[PDB]
Amino acid sequence: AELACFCYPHLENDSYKFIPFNNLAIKAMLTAKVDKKDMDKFYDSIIYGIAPPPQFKKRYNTNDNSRGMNFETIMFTKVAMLICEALNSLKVTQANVSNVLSRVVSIRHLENLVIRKENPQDILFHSKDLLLKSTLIAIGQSKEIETTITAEGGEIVFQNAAFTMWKLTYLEHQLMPILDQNFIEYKVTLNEDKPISDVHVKELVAELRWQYNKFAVITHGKGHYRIVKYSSVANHADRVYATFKSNVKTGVNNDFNLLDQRIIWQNWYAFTSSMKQGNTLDVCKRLLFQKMKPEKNPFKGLSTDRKMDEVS
Amino acid sequence: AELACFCYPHLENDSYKFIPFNNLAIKAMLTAKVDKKDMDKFYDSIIYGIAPPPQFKKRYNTNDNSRGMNFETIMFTKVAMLICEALNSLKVTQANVSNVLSRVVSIRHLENLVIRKENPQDILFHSKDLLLKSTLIAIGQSKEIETTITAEGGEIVFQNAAFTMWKLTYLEHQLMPILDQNFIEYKVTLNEDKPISDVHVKELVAELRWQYNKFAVITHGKGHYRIVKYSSVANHADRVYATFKSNVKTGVNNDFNLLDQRIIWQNWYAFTSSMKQGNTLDVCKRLLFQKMKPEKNPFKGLSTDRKMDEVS
Amino acid sequence: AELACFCYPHLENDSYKFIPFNNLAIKAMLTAKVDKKDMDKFYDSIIYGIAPPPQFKKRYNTNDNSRGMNFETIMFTKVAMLICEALNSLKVTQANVSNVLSRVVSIRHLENLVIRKENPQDILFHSKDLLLKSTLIAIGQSKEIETTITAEGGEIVFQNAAFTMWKLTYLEHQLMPILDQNFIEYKVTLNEDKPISDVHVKELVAELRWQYNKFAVITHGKGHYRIVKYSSVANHADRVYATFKSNVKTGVNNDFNLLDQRIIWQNWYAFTSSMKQGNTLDVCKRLLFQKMKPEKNPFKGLSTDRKMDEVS
Amino acid sequence: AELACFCYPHLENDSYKFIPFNNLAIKAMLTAKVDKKDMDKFYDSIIYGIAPPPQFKKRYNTNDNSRGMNFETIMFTKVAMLICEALNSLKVTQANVSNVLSRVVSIRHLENLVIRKENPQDILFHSKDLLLKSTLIAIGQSKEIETTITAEGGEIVFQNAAFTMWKLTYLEHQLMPILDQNFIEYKVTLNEDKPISDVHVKELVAELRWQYNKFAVITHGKGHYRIVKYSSVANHADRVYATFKSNVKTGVNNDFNLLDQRIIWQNWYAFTSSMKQGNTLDVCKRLLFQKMKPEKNPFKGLSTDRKMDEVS
Amino acid sequence: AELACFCYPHLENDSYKFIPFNNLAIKAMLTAKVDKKDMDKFYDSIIYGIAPPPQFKKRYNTNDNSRGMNFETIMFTKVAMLICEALNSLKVTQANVSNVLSRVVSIRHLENLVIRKENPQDILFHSKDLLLKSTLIAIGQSKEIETTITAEGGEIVFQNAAFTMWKLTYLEHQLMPILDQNFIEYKVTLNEDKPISDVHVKELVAELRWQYNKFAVITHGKGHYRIVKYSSVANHADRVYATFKSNVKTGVNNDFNLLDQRIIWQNWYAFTSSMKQGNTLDVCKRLLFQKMKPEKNPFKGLSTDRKMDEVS
Ligand SMILES: [Cl-]
Ligand SMILES: [Cl-]
Ligand SMILES: [Cl-]
Ligand SMILES: [Cl-]
Ligand SMILES: [Cl-]
Ligand code: NA
Fold first, then answer.
1. Neighbours of C (≥3 Cβ pairs closer than 8 A)?
2. Cβ atoms within 10 A of the Cβ of B229, count?
3. What is the per-residue burial (b if ≥16 Cβ within 10 Å, else e) of B235-245?
4. CA of E304 to nearest chain D CA: how many angstroms apart?
5. Among the three residues C101, C125, C144, which one is the final residue of a domain in this structure?
6. Is D290 found in the same domain as D159?
7. What are residue E143's DSSP bridge partners?
8. Where is the active site (chains A, B, C, D, E)?
9. Closest ligand (CA of C239)
């Protein structure tokens, strides 16, 4: 959803402050009769303060909508506040305010950051610097790459010197949970920006082959691995191409990190490489469904080793 | 119930302070044997402080009474405090204290204000000024008219630039809930920001005809619309007439605002107009039960009437 | 779903007997690996008897399917038995068996018949003749029209000499409930095959206008009225045209009863008339969205009468 | 309610057989549009058999009515069957059928009889003769007086050679419970129709004065004592007088048994005596509220004896 | 129990400070092996501080004892603190220190004072002086008579200018509840220890005769009325005489206030009068069981007046 679904701008001095919507203001807006010309304008609930532009009605869950967010939960407020705190640190100017608020982001990523931030065990709880950096990355206001330290979060299920693997517990989210109960997804973030040894790569690949054999190892080009069911790959390709195409259109920074060819699923590496080369969706995407000549396996015997390890 | 059911006066210098009753003081009063001459006097429970005059026993729910209020709930205390705060701002004098305390008010309206006041999302939570105004209107100590901003509240089910429609949550009340489970009633308050446009009048009437076709649009003359089941119209008629009649008997001025003839149910407009002309209840109600086709042109003859006035 | 989802044929004498599937046989079939050539063949679970052809997998709810039926409920067995009892009375021959089982029917209609049949208050409980007739109508093996006596059932919400109105309680079904919690639908069946007086029509129309103003009065041409939300009409038109088109294709009896033009929604009568006249979907369907010149209202003042009735 | 609210007559051979209504038939009738002239006729639900005449609608509890009976409970069916069994033993004639069913009876009395007859400890369980007799008395088809053996029932709280005292547990009833939670009432039936010794009368009076001092001892003239709160006495006077008047008007002999003047409350004896003498309600009632000079009581110091027994 | 069951003395400066036992110190003491010589010495649990003298073991509930107090409840600690607060205000010296802790008091009376004290509605909550007075009276360290203001507490069930009647809720107590579920007792305290008008006495007697006719009105001579079941009177007599006899033998003054003969049960008045005259238990107590010549009824017709009030 757009950042504009959570907060509205308020001019103080030369700079804009951002304020969370009250959930009852949103609720009022959803029952409102509004002229077409005012669909893109902030809404006055009268009793509960300002509400988001009515054009965003479908971002919110109601009796007849389950494709939006549960804005009446406490997590909505927590996420809104997370966003506001980050935006407030930016000193957004008159010129940029609309651009900033129109950015569409992952709400689940933000709920996960709230979960990190509120846990006294977690570094984000103790470092406002890292919390802000992590949030800025999540709301499209940073050039920095998401790494282990700034990761959205979840449950750590594997870790070595170079990598941290997280289970994304989207089924249990309050604000915008995944509704398909068969959903399972992980991400692998890089611990440091530093050359990674063959040994540490091998360790990750061995874990992925043994423990997550039914998962494709892919990436959306933003600097981390996404571990997804093979049955979901086509959808990921659609999302990835569209984002890439759009960035080419708006001339926005369209840097796409392919990541390690020894780790990424062979077909996905082919699909994304062809995409970067400037091919159309159809040329790209069909590479996903093709059985390819198995590349020179950089790490033979990995699964057998894990197997023998388990037996002993 | 009378305001004297919630608090008692204490003279301090030149004006009164009002103090809420302890619920156990009321409970003791209910078991008390009192001289007839003392039925109208505030009661000393000895252990729990002053209590309301025994003449108001029937205002309180007991084993042999379910037609009063639940004075042992926390809401009783909250409503009593709301009343006291408003009354304390008035500087009530000896000349007026009896009249003030004898004013009968809607307890449900007051519970609804407590509900608004205690919600951080609601402007009443943040504006002592508006809270006082809203309360003063509710307890009959204001010249002001209830509007959206000063409304008793409830659930907003429709809103446009000119109007806010509220569902009244009376079934869920703690202090004096409606006990008939078939109860459904709404109210429409004017936002009163700017002059009203007929665009917004048409929108309201369309919502009412389409979504609430089984409800009569009426008013009790206090400046807002009441959306009631047609099957409850006769009862509202009786209540409205009694209040009107009583104000005539006593001497209080009857300000009955008829509102918009295009919005009010035609029969209700006729009934209230006849009432305002001093007709008996029997004559007024006949209009309620009469089949009646809408008035084409209520403004026809306005100039001719002015003409004949000049001739006279 | 197809009748073939509930039972399989077994040759006894010259005639076919029909036997319900065990739900664990179906469950086994859903986990089975089957050759393309055998998708249309009955499945042998080995342990739990015969199961339906694997081509019907999507008729059954599983972890990854919510668009089918809950075949593990007792209602599945009850419906299967209802079907078998009716089919067994037919003495289906070798030639017809495949045709009979391929018929797609409403499962909810059948669950409703089970609910009627199992209620000792209901005539279907006491008359095997009427139960069989009702079931045959429901499974496409009868020329008879569904009437009040043979109705699928539900809750009676209105009745007069000529009509019976039923609420379809699909939200509460066990086998294949409607999942959209906003669903509401009724049907009006004719009590007798006998001319209906203007008075009795007027009574129905008055009820529909007063109590169900937000519902379109339509029909699928099979001899009864369907009372559906206006917001669902376009979908009904799609379903109705497809069925009509298909029947023209297979040369199947394509009799479409328009029903009473004084009762049916004006636009729906236009749409279905144009359909019968042989027009395309686009010519037909667009009549639904057009505001038409209100036809000569056969019953003026109906809503006003009900209104005045309620007030008194 | 009238007997016609529970069953309808069906002519078999020589005479009428009474058959209980299905509760869904009643439920259908409540939704039915019926011609004015047919309001007093038995209603055909089509689906669920015959229903009571629509003129009796208010006898049945619905969403908008709480003053009737809960006809969807199993007790409705049990009461109906009890009525039917009694009526079917009478061989009612054509000339009598309508009057028999028009009789208004106590539904609570009937539920109590059901409670008696279904209890294997109770004599009514083991004697169809006594059961029929008890029921015929309750439904106004007997010249017999209700005694202990044929009592409606309840809980026995006192018993001696001559009397049995019952607590009427109307609060716990399923069909038509008393809704006032403050309700308490007892009845004292005579164990047999014989002269009662002074000693056995004195024993009853002693118990009433000691254990039930806040209760008036009255009678409705049907041969037993009713023990009711003094605060309900005036209401009993209204009901009793109303019934007495009704009988005199319709030429029915009241046969009002005053009962023992040594037991009945003095003011009640005066009231009913004045009623039998033919006086107006106003004149009779005036005797209820008259602090009349005590008659000397024929049982001195009964409470003193009980006190001393308690202390020992 | 003895005050020494709740606290121990600690000399501080000129006088003793009293300190509550930890419940685990008591629990330890209950398992302790102690010399007979030390049974009357305070016990050192080592772990949980000082404990009561082992001679008081039976005052505490354990697996083999249910006749004591529940010392592990929070009410134990509250009562203990209530006692200490009162004793500490006395500046007890070596002179009286031992007699103070030996005094046996009503634990239930003390729990009731805690219940009064902790209630913001109660005057004891706001006045430390009245709280101390009330407690000092309850623990036998005051010459003042218990009145309404200083009452132990309970539920107010009647009140007039002169009296307050309390229900003792001993069944619900935590520390040492009455275990006989048949228990019911009230007390009537004087609002002021001043002469009381005949009218105000009459009001009390009328309430007692009407609402509490099965209760004997007695007193234990300490300045208030106790309303007890007639079946408990003989036991009260034994307790009262034993205390009187004991006070005589222990030099302590009796000061038995017989209270008002127009209120007290005749037999109790005779018994206690005879007691005050120095007669033996046999002579005193037999007056309880004698049917006495009725005394001139001071207020004839009280019962009739209430009856008439109830009927109207
Ligand atoms: Cl990525
Ligand atoms: Cl109003
Ligand atoms: Cl149809
Ligand atoms: Cl009687
Ligand atoms: Cl005492
Ligand atoms: Na009828």
1. A, B, D
2. 18
3. ebbeebbebbe
4. 8
5. C144
6. yes
7. none
8. 224
9. 3
